[PDB]
Amino acid sequence: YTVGIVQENNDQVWKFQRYFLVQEYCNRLNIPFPFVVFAYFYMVVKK
Amino acid sequence: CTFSGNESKPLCVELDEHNLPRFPEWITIPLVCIYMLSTNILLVNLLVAMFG
């Protein structure tokens, strides 16, 4: 019953969460993680 | 159990200074309880609902 009821309002919430995740990833260094640490060094040199 | 891997048996559990098992039941038993509850019951019923 719950699955039948809450289906229509599920994709909308997922799209909202998708916006959140996509903006989190875009508002990021966009560098592969195993080397991203270098950025944290380099950037902290400038900041 | 086998202390050495010579035999085709599971490795024996670690033992303490005294020759008694070293793991705590109060951690393992709740773990298995939760796992069985989640797998046997909840997940299968959810699958039934989605199939319906």
Ligand SMILES: CC(C)CCC[C@@H](C)[C@H]1CC[C@H]2[C@@H]3CC=C4C[C@@H](OC(=O)CCC(=O)O)CC[C@]4(C)[C@H]3CC[C@]12C
């Ligand atoms: C919330 C849901 C998903 C879990 C409920 C299942 C219960 C049956 C579990 C939860 C807590 C568990 C208990 C936590 C601690 C212990 C002590 C344990 O006794 C010992 O082995 C002590 C060892 C020692 O004294 O050295 C026996 C199981 C028991 C009652 C566990 C058995 C099963 C319990 C009651």
Ligand SMILES: FC(F)(F)c1ccccc1-c1cc(C(F)(F)F)c2[nH]c(C3=NOC4(CCCCC4)C3)nc2c1
């Ligand atoms: F159908 C289902 F999914 F069961 C479920 C249906 C309805 C409501 C909740 C759940 C659910 C969801 C999750 C989550 F999505 F959050 F993961 C669960 N996770 C766990 C466990 N976590 O770790 C365990 C495995 C690893 C060892 C420790 C125990 C089991 N039980 C869940 C039940």
